Amino acid sequence: MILHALTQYYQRKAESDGGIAQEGFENKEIPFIIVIDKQGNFIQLEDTRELKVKKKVGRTFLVPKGLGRSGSKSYEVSNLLWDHYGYVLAYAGEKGQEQADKQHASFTAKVNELKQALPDDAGVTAVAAFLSSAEEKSKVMQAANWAECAKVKGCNLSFRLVDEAVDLVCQSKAVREYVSQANQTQSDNAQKGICLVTGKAAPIARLHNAVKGVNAKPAPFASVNLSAFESYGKEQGFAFPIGEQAMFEYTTALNTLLAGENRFRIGDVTTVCWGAKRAHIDAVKALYKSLYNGQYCKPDGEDKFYLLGLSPNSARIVVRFWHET
RNA sequence: GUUGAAACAGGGUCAGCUUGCCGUAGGUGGCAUCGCCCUCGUC
Numbered sequence A: 001m002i003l004h005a006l007t008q009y010y011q012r013k014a015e016s017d018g019g020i021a022q023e024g025f026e027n028k029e030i031p032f033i034i035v036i037d038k039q040g041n042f043i044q045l046e047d048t049r050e051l052k053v054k055k056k057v058g059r060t061f062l063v064p065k066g067l068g069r070s071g072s073k074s075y076e077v078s079n080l081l082w083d084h085y086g087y088v089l090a091y092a093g094e095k096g097q098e099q100a101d102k103q104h105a106s107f108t109a110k111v112n113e114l115k116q117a118l119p120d121d122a123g124v125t126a127v128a129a130f131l132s133s134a135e136e137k138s139k140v141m142q143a144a145n146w147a148e149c150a151k152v153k154g155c156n157l158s159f160r161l162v163d164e165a166v167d168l169v170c171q172s173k174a175v176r177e178y179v180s181q182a183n184q185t186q187s188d189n190a191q192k193g194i195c196l197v198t199g200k201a202a203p204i205a206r207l208h209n210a211v212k213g214v215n216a217k218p219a220p221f222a223s224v225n226l227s228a229f230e231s232y233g234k235e236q237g238f239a240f241p242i243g244e245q246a247m248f249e250y251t252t253a254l255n256t257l258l259a260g261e262n263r264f265r266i267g268d269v270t271t272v273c274w275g276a277k278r279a280h281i282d283a284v285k286a287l288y289k290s291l292y293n294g295q296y297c298k299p300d301g302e303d304k305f306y307l308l309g310l311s312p313n314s315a316r317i318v319v320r321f322w323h324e325t
Numbered sequence B: 001g002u003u004g005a006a007a008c009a010g011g012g013u014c015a016g017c018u019u020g021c022c023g024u025a026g027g028u029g030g031c032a033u034c035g036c037c038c039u040c041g042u043c
Helices: A004-014 A101-117 A124-130 A175-182 A244-257
Strands: A025-030 A032-036 A042-047 A059-064 A158-160 A270-273 A307-311
Touching (some): A004 A244, A101 A175, A124 A158
Parallel strands (some): A032 A158
Antiparallel strands (some): A025 A059, A032 A042
């Protein structure tokens, strides 16, 4: 019940309305947010950081799910609206040219195909014309707080249109349906069942998503690579017959659990905990309020469900806690 | 005779380079074994 209980918990937290991913999204921490108008025109380089003692990468936002880059020719991935700082302005402080310009080309091709596949929106058109103007992207570097996003690497950039100032370009009721259909019709034409945690059909989720929060890099939880990690010659990903509608759910659940109030590490291991809500545990997650008060009592309402104490390493996630009691 | 196969915790490194328990000092200023008794009480 590694991902079975996690899937059941996600099916409980998703239908509770409390800031969680769905279909094909994920709560990503975007540092600097770019605000424009209706037709390109870079007009604001806003930043929403300043949280803890260290300047985190901005607030959390429900962006489309990351397709999982990390590779040589990594520009062939080309995410939807959110990516790296070399996919928007083709800038590279330590990445270099050529390799970063092709990333911008792939990103503008992606936004162009999204525009031609979903027109009349006053949102995707702005980001599509912003990358094909060749006069505002250079102005982005000459903003007001641009000298701060260059000293820190891994700066994610998002787009926010005008007449909203609260919803990103990937938040209006238009591209959300496209992203939901991508993980419903496009991401369902592959290998058949049977699933691993749901027992139903579901396509075999090849190339599992990456979990951000455990390690410095988005470390994938369960992912088979190399060669000896195969059972019967499944060759990368097919070793675990896990469906998309469950792998995505567990990855998004680990992402939401590695960035909220339940995220706390005792020492080189993040021992995140949760409950069944039928959460309100106030026992394991209550290990960092203010000055450690006395909240332990006996109200005959001790919820069940175990806790997953996972630890990072290089880019994998190691499981060490397993106890239903 | 068609069934978990492959796994190293290691490659390896002086806990010391070192340090006076020491300058510090009267067991003493001071007190009768005595105030007392036949080895014959017998021969």
